[PDB]
Amino acid sequence: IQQYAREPISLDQTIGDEGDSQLGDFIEDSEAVVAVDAVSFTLLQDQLQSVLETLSEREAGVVRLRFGLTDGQPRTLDEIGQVYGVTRERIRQIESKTMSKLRHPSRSQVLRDYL
Amino acid sequence: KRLKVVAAFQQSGNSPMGMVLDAVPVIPPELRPMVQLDGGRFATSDLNDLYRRVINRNNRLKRLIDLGAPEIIVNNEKRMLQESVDALFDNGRRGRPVTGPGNRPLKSLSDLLKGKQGRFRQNLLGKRVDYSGRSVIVVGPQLKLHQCGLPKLMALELFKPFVMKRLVDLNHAQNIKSAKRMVERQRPQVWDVLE
Amino acid sequence: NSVPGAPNRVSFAKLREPLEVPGLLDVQTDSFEWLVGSDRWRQAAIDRGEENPVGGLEEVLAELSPIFSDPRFDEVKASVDECKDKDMTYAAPLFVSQTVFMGDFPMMTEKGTFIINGTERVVVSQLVRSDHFGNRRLRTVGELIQNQIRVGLSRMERVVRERMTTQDVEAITPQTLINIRPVVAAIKEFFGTSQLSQFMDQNNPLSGLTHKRRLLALGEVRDVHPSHYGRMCPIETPEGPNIGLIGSLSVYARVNPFGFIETPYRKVENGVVTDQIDYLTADEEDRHVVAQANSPTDENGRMVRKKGGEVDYMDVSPRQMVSVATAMIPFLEHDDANRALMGANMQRQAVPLVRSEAPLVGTGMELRAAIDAGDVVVADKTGVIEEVSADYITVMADDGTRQSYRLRKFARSNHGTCANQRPIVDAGQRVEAGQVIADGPCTQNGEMALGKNLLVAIMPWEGHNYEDAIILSNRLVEEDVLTSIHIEEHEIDARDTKLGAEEITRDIPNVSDEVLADLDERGIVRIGAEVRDGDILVGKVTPKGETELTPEERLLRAIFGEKAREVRDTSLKVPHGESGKVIGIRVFSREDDDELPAGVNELVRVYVAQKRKISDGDKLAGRHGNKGVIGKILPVEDMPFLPDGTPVDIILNTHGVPRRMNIGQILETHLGWVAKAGWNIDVAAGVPDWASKLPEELYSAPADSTVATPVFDGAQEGELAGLLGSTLPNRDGEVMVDADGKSTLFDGRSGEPFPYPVTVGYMYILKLHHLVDDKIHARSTGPYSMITQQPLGGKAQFGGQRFGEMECWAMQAYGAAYTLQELLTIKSDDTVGRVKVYEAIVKGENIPEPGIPESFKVLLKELQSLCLNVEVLSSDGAAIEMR
Amino acid sequence: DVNFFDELRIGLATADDIRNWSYGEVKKPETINYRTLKPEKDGLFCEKIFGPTRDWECYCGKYKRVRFKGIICERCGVEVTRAKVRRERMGHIELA
DNA sequence: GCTTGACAAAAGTGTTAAATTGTGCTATACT
Numbered sequence A: 001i002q003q004y005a006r007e008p009i010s011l012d013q014t015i016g017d018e019g020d021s022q023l024g025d026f027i028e029d030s031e032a033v034v035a036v037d038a039v040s041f042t043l044l045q046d047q048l049q050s051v052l053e054t055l056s057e058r059e060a061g062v063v064r065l066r067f068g069l070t071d072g073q074p075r076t077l078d079e080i081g082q083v084y085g086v087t088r089e090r091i092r093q094i095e096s097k098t099m100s101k102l103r104h105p106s107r108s109q110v111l112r113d114y115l
Numbered sequence B: 001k002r003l004k005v006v007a008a009f010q011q012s013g014n015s016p017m018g019m020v021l022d023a024v025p026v027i028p029p030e031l032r033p034m035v036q037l038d039g040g041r042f043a044t045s046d047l048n049d050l051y052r053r054v055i056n057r058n059n060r061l062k063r064l065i066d067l068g069a070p071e072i073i074v075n076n077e078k079r080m081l082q083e084s085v086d087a088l089f090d091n092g093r094r095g096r097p098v099t100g101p102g103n104r105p106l107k108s109l110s111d112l113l114k115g116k117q118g119r120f121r122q123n124l125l126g127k128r129v130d131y132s133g134r135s136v137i138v139v140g141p142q143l144k145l146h147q148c149g150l151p152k153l154m155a156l157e158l159f160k161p162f163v164m165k166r167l168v169d170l171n172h173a174q175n176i177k178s179a180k181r182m183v184e185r186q187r188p189q190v191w192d193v194l195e
Numbered sequence C: 001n002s003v004p005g006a007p008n009r010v011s012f013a014k015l016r017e018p019l020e021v022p023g024l025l026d027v028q029t030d031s032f033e034w035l036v037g038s039d040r041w042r043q044a045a046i047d048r049g050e051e052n053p054v055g056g057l058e059e060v061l062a063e064l065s066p067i068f069s070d071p072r073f074d075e076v077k078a079s080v081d082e083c084k085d086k087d088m089t090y091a092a093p094l095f096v097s098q099t100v101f102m103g104d105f106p107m108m109t110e111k112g113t114f115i116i117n118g119t120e121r122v123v124v125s126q127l128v129r130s131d132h133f134g135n136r137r138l139r140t141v142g143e144l145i146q147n148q149i150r151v152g153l154s155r156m157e158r159v160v161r162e163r164m165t166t167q168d169v170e171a172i173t174p175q176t177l178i179n180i181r182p183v184v185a186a187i188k189e190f191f192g193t194s195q196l197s198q199f200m201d202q203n204n205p206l207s208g209l210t211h212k213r214r215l216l217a218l219g220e221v222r223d224v225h226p227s228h229y230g231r232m233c234p235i236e237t238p239e240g241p242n243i244g245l246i247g248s249l250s251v252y253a254r255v256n257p258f259g260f261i262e263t264p265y266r267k268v269e270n271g272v273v274t275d276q277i278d279y280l281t282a283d284e285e286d287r288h289v290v291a292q293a294n295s296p297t298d299e300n301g302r303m304v305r306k307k308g309g310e311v312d313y314m315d316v317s318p319r320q321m322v323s324v325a326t327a328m329i330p331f332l333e334h335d336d337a338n339r340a341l342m343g344a345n346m347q348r349q350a351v352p353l354v355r356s357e358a359p360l361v362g363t364g365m366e367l368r369a370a371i372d373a374g375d376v377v378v379a380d381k382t383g384v385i386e387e388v389s390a391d392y393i394t395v396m397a398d399d400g401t402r403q404s405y406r407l408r409k410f411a412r413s414n415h416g417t418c419a420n421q422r423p424i425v426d427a428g429q430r431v432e433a434g435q436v437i438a439d440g441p442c443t444q445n446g447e448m449a450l451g452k453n454l455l456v457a458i459m460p461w462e463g464h465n466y467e468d469a470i471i472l473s474n475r476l477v478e479e480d481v482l483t484s485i486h487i488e489e490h491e492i493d494a495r496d497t498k499l500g501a502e503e504i505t506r507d508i509p510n511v512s513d514e515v516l517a518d519l520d521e522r523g524i525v526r527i528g529a530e531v532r533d534g535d536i537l538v539g540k541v542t543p544k545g546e547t548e549l550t551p552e553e554r555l556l557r558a559i560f561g562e563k564a565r566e567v568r569d570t571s572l573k574v575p576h577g578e579s580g581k582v583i584g585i586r587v588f589s590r591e592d593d594d595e596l597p598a599g600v601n602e603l604v605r606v607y608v609a610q611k612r613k614i615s616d617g618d619k620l621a622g623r624h625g626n627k628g629v630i631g632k633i634l635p636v637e638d639m640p641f642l643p644d645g646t647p648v649d650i651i652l653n654t655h656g657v658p659r660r661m662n663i664g665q666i667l668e669t670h671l672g673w674v675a676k677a678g679w680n681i682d683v684a685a686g687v688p689d690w691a692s693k694l695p696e697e698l699y700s701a702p703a704d705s706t707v708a709t710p711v712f713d714g715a716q717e718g719e720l721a722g723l724l725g726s727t728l729p730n731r732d733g734e735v736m737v738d739a740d741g742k743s744t745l746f747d748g749r750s751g752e753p754f755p756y757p758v759t760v761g762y763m764y765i766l767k768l769h770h771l772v773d774d775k776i777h778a779r780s781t782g783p784y785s786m787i788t789q790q791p792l793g794g795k796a797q798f799g800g801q802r803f804g805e806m807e808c809w810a811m812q813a814y815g816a817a818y819t820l821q822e823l824l825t826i827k828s829d830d831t832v833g834r835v836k837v838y839e840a841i842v843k844g845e846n847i848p849e850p851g852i853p854e855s856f857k858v859l860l861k862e863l864q865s866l867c868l869n870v871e872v873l874s875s876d877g878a879a880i881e882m883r
Numbered sequence D: 001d002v003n004f005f006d007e008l009r010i011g012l013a014t015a016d017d018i019r020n021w022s023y024g025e026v027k028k029p030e031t032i033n034y035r036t037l038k039p040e041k042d043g044l045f046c047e048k049i050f051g052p053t054r055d056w057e058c059y060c061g062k063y064k065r066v067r068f069k070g071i072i073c074e075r076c077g078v079e080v081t082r083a084k085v086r087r088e089r090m091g092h093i094e095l096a
Numbered sequence E: 001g002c003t004t005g006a007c008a009a010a011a012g013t014g015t016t017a018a019a020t021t022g023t024g025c026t027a028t029a030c031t
C-alpha cells in the first residue's frame, strides 16, 4: 500500500544548479540500439550462415525452422515434420544429431566468443 | 495596422476559423514520457497534467450538457475548459500559471519550445556530441605548432572503434568482441596499435 | 600561546593580544542553545542579564497560549556516529489535559552541525534588516529555526479551529484536534530543501569552520560598509556572481541576544588603553570615537574612525575586520585584496595529505583554528594517559574519572576526502585540560597543516613553467609528500518492482568465472580487493519480462547448452576512469529487520579508497592566491640544485608582473629559508638598528624553527634582510643563500651553473580539490537520453562534451560545413546515423551521409502540438513526413 | 528522409488537419495502471493510438513475433510495428 | 531411415470462485 501512495515527480523540474539542465535530460533510453552489438549481431548472423553450410541441406533447414531463423517464428516438431513430411519424432531425432554436429570442436569453437 | 492581419488571410488560403479549435492535438507520449526513476520513484512531464486538466474539464462538460444543467454551470465549464487549453499551450500568458506541488509553474508547450536552455535557442542549436573529451591543460614547450599532447587514456577511448579494427586486422584479436575487451582492459598490446 | 600543549612558534608581534580569541564556533551553538533553552544558557544569561529568559520554543508557546506549555525533550534517540551510519536524522522527540508528541526534533552536534537523514548539515546565519548598514539584524541559527516553527504552530491552530466546530463537544480531546503533520513537516521541510540549510563543506577542517560563521548579506548592495569593520570580513567572498552577498564572520565578532552583531572594543580614556572591553553594536560605535589598532604606545600605557566617516574607544587588536581564513595568510598587509580573497578561498580548497606537515612560516590562527574546527581530539580534563592505540585513547584524570576518545580512522568526508586522526601522545604523558591528544586530517601538533613546505626557485625553466604552470621534483611522488587519500562511496538497492522483486546475488547471467573471481558468496566485492574500471562491486539481478529472445541467440543457446536465464543483469560496476581498493562494506538486509524504504529488501554500500600521488595536471596554490597546474615533473637528477647537491622541489616562474606584484608570496619564501636554516644576529657591541623593534626570542633560533607573523602585526622589511644576513651553514659550513635570498643553481641537465643567482626558499603550497583523475573525460560511444536522443552522460561516465551555440559560430567562421554537420547529426541526434557510422568505422568503409537530427523532428512535433500545421515542402515533392 | 528539402512552410492547423494527424481520440485522463504500470486504454499513453511499448508486440500478446507487421490485433487494438512510432504518432481531443 | 504407441509435460480452454473496481448513498442545519 505504501508503494501505491507515492506520487510521481516532474521531469520538467530543474535538478541541475541554476537551470543548467532539467531532470528529464539525465534519463537513459535503455531501449536505444547499441552500435557495437548491432555489428556483432550482424557478424554472428554471418558466422552462423557458414556453420549452416556445413550441415545437410535438409538438416540446416530443420535448424532454421526449429528456432525460426528464417521466418522469425519457431515451429514445433510436428510443424517441422509437416513441411518435411515425416513424423514429429523423426524431426526430434534429426535435431538432436544436428546439435551433436554443432557441438563438434571444428564447428563450435568459433562461436564461443559470442556468449 | 489591422489591415495587415486582414490582408494576410486574403492573400493566403488560411481560413480564419483556425484561430478557434474544435479539436486539440495530443503530443506523442515519448516527448511527454512517464518513466520510473532510479530508486523506485516515478517521473513524468507536466504536459500529462495539463492534458489531464483539459480532458477532465472537457468530459465534465459533456456530462453537464447531457444533464441539461443551467447555463451558469455549463458556461462556467466552458470558461474552465478555455483556460485549460490556454494553460496547455502557453501557461501563465494569462492569469496566474497552473502550478503543481511546491507552487512551481507547469511547463506548457510554449516553454518547452523556447528558452535559453530550451529546445528553441540552444538545446536545438547546441547539443552534445560523441567522440569527444576534455581535461586540464598544461604547457607543452617542446611541441611543434601543429602538435598537441593527448593523454594516452583519452586518445584510447576516443579512437576506440579505430584501434578495435586495427588490432583485429592484425591477428591480435580474432573478432570485434575480442577487440573490445582488449581495449577496455587496456592490455599493453594496443598502445603500439594506437600510435 | 595560552594553550596547554601549544607548540613553540615564535611571533613577530609588536602588540599583545589583550582578548583571547572567542570560541569561533559559538555563533551556531549559542543560537541553538537559546532555541532549545538549555540550562547552560539560562545559567549564563541570568548571571549577567534578565532573570526570566524565555527559550525560543518557550517564547513561541507564550505568545500562542492561550490557544500548550512545558514542552519536554527526551534524550537523543541515537548517537551522531550511529545516525550517520544508519542514514537517520540526529533528533530528540519533544512533548507538550491530553499530552501530545509533536515530533522528532533535530539536534545540533558539538561541532555546531546537524545530522539530517545521515548527512552532516550546517545552517547559515542570515543577515536581514530589522537601509543603513547598522540596520542589519542577522538571524542566528536558533532564531530562524524558531520562525519556521511559528509557521508550523500557527497553521496547526488553523486546523484545530476547523476541527472543533465540526467535531462534537466533549467528544474531542487535544489528541483528536491536534494534527501535528504541518508541524513536523515544517521542520523536515526546512533542514532539507531550504537554501540556508546546506551540506557541510568539509574537505579540510578550515573549510567546515568557515562554512559555519558564514552569513548572508541580503534578506551598491554588494559593496562593503564602514560598519562591517570587525563584524563581516570584506576580504572573503565568492569569486562568482555572488560577491558581496556572502561573507564570513570576523574573528572576534560576537552576537547580542537579538542578533545584532557586536564587536569587541576597549574604551580609551585620557590617551591610555583601558583593559575594559565592552560590546559596541554598529549604532553604539558612532557614539564613541574608535581608535586604530596599530598605534604608537610607549612603554606602560601611551587615525581613528569617525561616527559616520573615516579617519573614545580603542580596537581590541588587529585583524578584527579579518576572518579566520583571511587571518591565516602570512604577510596579508602586502597582498592585494583580490589575491587575499583568492588566497582565503583556496585555503579551504586544500585536501588532507597523508603526512600533513605544519607550515614553516605561519601566523597565529593555526593553533586556535584547528582545535576550534572540531576535527582535533582535545582532552577535557587534566590527567595522564592510560592507553594509546590507533583505535582509541584513554586518560586517567587526577579527579579519578576515566575518559576515552575513539579516533576517526579513514572516514570518508562529504566530498571523498579522507579524515584520519593520528594520536600525538604516549603512554605516561601527563596532559592538561584543553590540550591536543590526536591530530586531525589537516593538522600537526594542534595547528592547521593544509599543505607542505617545499624548496622553491623563482626562475623560468625552459618554458615548462610558463604563465601559471609549475614543475615539481619527482621526490614529491617518491616520498609521498603531496599524496592524499580519497574515498568514494557506491550504493545499490534491492526493492520490489512492477513485475518482480530485485535480488542481489553473485550469479550473473553472461559472465566468466574470472570477472566474478573477486566477488564473495553473496555477490559483493570482498574487502581489500583491487577494482579496475568496469569491475563488478555488487551483483544485483532483477526480473525481466517476456524474453522474446532473438532466434540467432537461441541457436547458440542450444549449441553451447547455456539455458537462457530468466531475468536481466543489473550489477554495480566501478565508474569509468576510477580505481582503488575496497575499504568497507555496509549491508542492510530485510530478513535482518533493519529499516528500509517501502519495497527495499537489501541495501549495501561499498567504500573504495584511492592513494593519489601528486600528478602532472593537478592544481597547486599558495596562501596568497597564486595558483597553477603541474606542467611537468622532472626526475630529481635534472633539477636546479644548490651547491649542496640539494635539488629544489618546485620551480615557479615570476608570475607577478609589475604593478600586479603579489608581494606577500616573496616575503614568506625568504622567511621560509630563514626558518629552515635558523639564524643568529651575531650581536657585537649592541644589536643592529633594525632589530631594535624586535623582541628577544627571535635573536637566536635553531634550524627548522616555525615562525608566526600575525597578519597586520608581523615581521617587517628591515627585520627580514637582517635575518637574511644570519644563516647557519649546512654540513661543511658552506653557505647556500646570500643576503639577497638568491643562490647559484646548477642546471641538473647541462651540469653548468645558471649564469645569474636565482631566488630560492621554502614556500607553503597546498593541493587543491581540482584533480586530474576527476576532470579527465573521454567518450567514443555511450548512453543517450530518452526524450532527446543526444549523448547523455551515463551515471557510470562517458558523458559527451557540449558543442554550444558559440562553438557553432566558430565552426561556421572557418567554413567547415561538413565538420559542423557531422557534430550536430551523426555525432548526436541521428538515431540511425551514429550507429551506421560506428558500423562503417569498424568495417573501414566511408562514413555515410548524415540523416535528420532527432532534435529537428521533435521541433516539428512541438509545433504541431501548438496547432501549427508545418510541412517540410520539397522543391517538387509537395509535403513530406519523417516517419 | 532524403535530407534535401527545398522549402519549409507553416499555417493555421484546422480542426480537420488535427483530426487527420491524430491516430485516435484520447478519451480518458488516465496514464498507467497503478498496479500493472501499463498504459491504460483510451487514455494518455494508450498503445491502441500512440503505439506499442515493445517492438512488434501487441498489448494482450496474441501477436509477438516480427513475423506479422502492419496488422492490428483484433483484441487489444494495437498495431504490430516498431516501438518508435510511440514518438511519431499524435492523438487529439474533440472539444464539447 | 523411419514410424509406432506409450507416457509425460506442457500448453491451452472452459467453468468458477475471489478480488478488484465503479457507482450510489448518507435527512438538525450549514449558502
Ligand SMILES: C/C(=C\[C@H](C)CCCCC(=O)O)[C@@H]1O[C@@H]2C=C[C@@H]1OC(=O)\C=C/C=C\C=C\[C@H]1O[C@@H]3C[C@H]1O[C@@H](/C=C/C[C@H]1O[C@H](C[C@H](O)[C@H]1C)[C@@H](O)[C@@H](O)/C=C/CC/C=C/C2)[C@@H]3C
Binding pocket: C124, C194, C195, C196, C197, C198, C199, C200, C201, C207, C210, C211, C212, C214, C215, C216, C237, C238, C239, C240, C242, C246, C348
Ligand atoms: C549561492 C548560495 C549557496 C550555494 C549553494 C553555495 C554558495 C556558492 C558561493 C561559492 O562557493 O563561491 C546561497 O546560500 C544561502 C542562500 C542563498 C544562496 O543559495 C542559492 O542561490 C543556491 C543554493 C542554496 C542552498 C543549497 C543546498 C543544497 O544544494 C547542495 C546540497 C545542499 O547544500 C549545498 C551545499 C553548499 C556548501 C558550499 O559551501 C561552500 C563551498 C561550496 O560552494 C559548497 C560546498 C563553502 O565555501 C562555504 O564556506 C560557503 C557557503 C555559502 C554561504 C551562503 C548562505 C546563503 C549543495 C550545493
Ligand SMILES: [Zn+2]
Binding pocket: D058, D059, D060, D061, D062, D063, D073, D074, D075, D076, D077, D078
Ligand atoms: Zn493484442
